[PDB]
Each structure stands twice: as C-alpha cells, then as structure tokens.
Amino acid sequence: AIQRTPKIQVYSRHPPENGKPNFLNCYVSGFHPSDIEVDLLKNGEKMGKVEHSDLSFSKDWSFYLLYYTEFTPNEKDEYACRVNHVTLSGPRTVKWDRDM
Amino acid sequence: AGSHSMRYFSTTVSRPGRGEPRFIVVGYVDDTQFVRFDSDAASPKMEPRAPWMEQEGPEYWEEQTRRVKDAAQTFRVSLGNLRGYYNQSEAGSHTLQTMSGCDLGPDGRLLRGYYQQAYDGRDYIALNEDLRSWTAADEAAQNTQRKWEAAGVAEQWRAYLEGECLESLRRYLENGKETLQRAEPPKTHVTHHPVSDHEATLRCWALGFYPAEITLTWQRDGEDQTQDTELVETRPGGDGTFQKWGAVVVPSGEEQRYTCHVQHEGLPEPLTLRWEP
Ligand SMILES: CCCCCCCCCCCCCCCC(=O)OC[C@H](O)CO
Ligand SMILES: [Zn+2]
Numbered sequence: 547a548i549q550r551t552p553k554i555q556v557y558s559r560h561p562p563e564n565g566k567p568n569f570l571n572c573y574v575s576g577f578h579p580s581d582i583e584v585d586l587l588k589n590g591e592k593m594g595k596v597e598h599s600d601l602s603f604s605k606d607w608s609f610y611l612l613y614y615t616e617f618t619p620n621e622k623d624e625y626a627c628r629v630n631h632v633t634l635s636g637p638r639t640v641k642w643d644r645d646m
Numbered sequence: 647a648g649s650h651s652m653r654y655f656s657t658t659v660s661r662p663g664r665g666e667p668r669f670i671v672v673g674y675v676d677d678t679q680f681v682r683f684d685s686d687a688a689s690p691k692m693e694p695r696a697p698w699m700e701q702e703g704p705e706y707w708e709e710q711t712r713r714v715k716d717a718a719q720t721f722r723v724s725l726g727n728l729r730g731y732y733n734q735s736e737a738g739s740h741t742l743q744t745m746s747g748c749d750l751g752p753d754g755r756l757l758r759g760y761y762q763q764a765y766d767g768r769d770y771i772a773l774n775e776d777l778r779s780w781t782a783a784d785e786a787a788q789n790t791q792r793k794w795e796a797a798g799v800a801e802q803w804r805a806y807l808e809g810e811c812l813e814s815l816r817r818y819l820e821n822g823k824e825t826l827q828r829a830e831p832p833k834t835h836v837t838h839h840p841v842s843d844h845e846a847t848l849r850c851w852a853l854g855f856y857p858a859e860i861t862l863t864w865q866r867d868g869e870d871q872t873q874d875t876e877l878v879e880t881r882p883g884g885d886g887t888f889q890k891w892g893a894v895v896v897p898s899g900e901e902q903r904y905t906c907h908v909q910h911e912g913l914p915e916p917l918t919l920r921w922e923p
C-alpha cells in the first residue's frame with residue numbers, strides 16, 4: 547500500500563480583520579490512506595463546532611478534506627490546526643499565520 | 647469553459663472483523679460538489695450537497711441510492727477478490743477507489759468518458775478512451791479485465807457515458823446555472839515582508855476564484871522561477887471559491903525584476919503583477 551503524508555494549510559475564508567466574523571479553515575490534502583484526525587485549536591484548546599467536507603480525492607488518488615468553523619479573530623487569540631495520520635510521528639500542529 | 651465535467655469519486659475501505667467495508671461516494675459537476683453517500687450514516691442514502699439539487703424529487707434519490715448500494719456490494723466483493731489475488735492477509739485494511747464520469751463538449755458531444763479504479767492508492771484498471779477496451783496495471787487487473795470482458799462491462803459503461811451521463815450533466819448545468827456557468831476571476835495582490843534588511847518575501851495572492859484551475863508563476867526578468875517559488879496547493883474558501891498563493895524571497899534591490907503572472911478562465915487577459923510599494 548502507498549502511504550502519502552498530508553499537506554496542511556490553515557487559513558481564513560476572508561482576509562482576517564478583528565471583530566468581523568469569518569471562517570477558520572484547515573485544508574488537508576495529498577494523503578493516503580484515508581483515515582485521519584484533524585482538530586482546530588483556539589489558544590491550544592480543541593474547538594467545538596468544527597465541520598468537515600465529504601471525503602474526496604485528487605487525480606493521483608490522494609485524499610483531501612476541509613475542516614472549518616465559524617470564528618471572529620482578534621489581537622489576543624492564536625489558532626492552529628492539529629493533524630494526525632499514520633505517515634506522521636505523531637500529531638502535527640500548524641499555527642495560523644494571519645499576515646501573509 | 648467549452649468543456650464541463652461530471653465525476654463520481656467512491657472510496658471503499660475494508661475493516662476486517664470490524665464490519666462490512668465503509669463506502670463513501672461524492673459527486674461533482676466541475677469543481678462543485680453536488681451529492682454524497684456515506685455507508686456509515688444513520689439512514690444511508692444519496693443526499694444533496696448543493697442547493698440547486700434540492701429540487702429533484704424523491705424518485706431521483708431512490709434510484710441514485712439503489713445504484714450506489716449496488717456498486718458498494720460489487721466493490722466489497724472486489725476487495726475480497728483483490729486480497730486473494732495479491733495473497734494478502736485477511737486482517738489488513740485495504741482501499742478500492744473508483745472514478746467515473748463524462749466531459750461534455752460545447753456542442754453537446756462526449757469529449758471523454760471515464761471509469762477507472764485504484765487499489766491501495768495505485769492505478770489498477772481503466773476504461774480506455776474508446777469506451778470498448780481496458781488498460782490493466784498488472785496480472786491481477788488483467789484477470790479483472792477478462793471477467794469484465796466476459797460480462798460486457800465496457801458496453802454497459804459506454805451506453806451510460808454517451809447517454810445518461812451527459813443528459814444528467816446537462817440538467818445539472820441548467821438547474822445550477824448561476825453557480826456552475828460562472829467564471830469568477832481571482833482578486834489578486836502582491837505583499838512584501840522583509841526577511842532581513844537586505845531581502846524580502848514577495849507573495850502573490852489569488853482569492854475568490856472559480857473554477858479551481860489557475861496558473862500562478864513568478865518570473866525574474868521574464869525567466870520562470872518555479873525552482874525558487876513556494877507555491878501552495880489550490881485550496882477551497884469553503885464558499886464555493888478557491889485560493890492560491892506563490893512566494894519568492896528576493897534581494898531588496900531586485901524586487902522590481904520580479905513579476906507574478908496569473909491566468910484564469912474568468913480573466914479577460916492574463917495578469918502581470920508586481921510589488922507596488
Ligand atoms: C465512481 C463511481 C462509479 C460507480 C460506483 C458508485 C456509484 C456512484 C453513483 C452513480 C455514478 C454513476 C454510476 C451509475 C451509472 C450506471 O448505472 O451504469 C453503470 C454501467 O452501466 C455499468 O453497469
Ligand atoms: Zn420509487
């Protein structure tokens with residue numbers, strides 16, 4: 547069986563500007579096999595209300611998933627995505643970089 | 647957008663001793679998902695995943711659910727046959743993925759019909775473009791190919807791909823016309839972030855675009871910088887649009903040598919962008 551490690555992007559639907567409701571996205575792609583664990587984290591805490599897309603895959607048969615939740619950014623808070631998959635040593639945490 | 651596509655993507659994952667294999671199907675028209683089936687759902691049935699699919703009546707959903715359940719049973723049998731072909735252990739979990747669908751040309755003709763499978767993430771068997779022959783990856787698939795030639799599987803798929811596949815896609819394209827027959831151009835800009843007092847990251851953004859296909863490349867005096875460009879995967883906004891960016895780290899005094907070139911169906915002309923301080 548082929549094993550492919552997930553790519554991880556954490557980003558907002560719209561340009562982030564504080565006090566304005568927005569959507570926090572964690573897109574995980576390029577992985578195989580399909581079992582995966584994904585959490586959205588607010589200040590290191592697991593978030594509730596996180597939905598995800600239906601499992602689909604790309605032309606090379608690797609899988610992708612969008613995890614997403616309503617949120618409203620501000621100066622204090624930090625967000626991140628945490629992903630675990632059999633290709634990884636253990637759960638990988640990628641922080642939301644909001645000024646690219 | 648002379649060509650439009652419909653695709654069904656199914657994933658079947660065995661879990662021996664832990665129940666029958668899990669089966670998930672999703673359907674797309676171009677880059678817009680419109681249906682799903684999950685065998686682990688409470689009442690497994692084909693369900694709409696686009697608002698423009700909510701005007702189909704219950705007999706449509708019944709037929710779609712029956713076809714998906716029929717396919718799922720065939721895929722469960724196939725996973726068992728494949729494990730035996732490859733002399734694999736009965737304890738391990740394996741994956742069968744299938745893709746099917748059609749490309750509809752601007753004149754209504756079938757540009758291309760597809761039916762292909764992968765086993766554990768590697769190409770296994772594929773319907774050839776003539777919809778009457780097969781390409782097999784190995785001897786396991788050559789055995790599948792013979793069983794499918796015996797049962798006339800190619801002709802069953804050609805009938806569907808040349809007929810109902812295109813008729814369904816046509817109907818979806820009309821029912822969801824305002825979503826599907828749009829070309830939303832990307833909103834683009836370039837950002838600049840110093841990395842030392844002598845170098846800066848230039849990042850070229852494309853946001854809010856549909857469909858997903860896009861080209862975004864950095865050039866230095868017209869020369870492609872693909873080897874020195876960080877280019878992220880095109881990613882969904884979650885609202886039916888897509889996003890992408892590419893970035894290069896450049897000497898401060900060379901910043902105006904760099905241009906970002908963006909091509910997308912929704913753009914009248916390809917874009918040439920530069921860092922605008
Ligand atoms: C990659 C999915 C391919 C099928 C697996 C899951 C069913 C998916 C729902 C229907 C898709 C179109 C399949 C139904 C088309 C159909 O009924 O005809 C077939 C050929 O005629 C062979 O019998
Ligand atoms: Zn009925």
Ligand SMILES: [Zn+2]
Pocket residue numbers: 838840845846898901
């Ligand atoms: Zn600079």
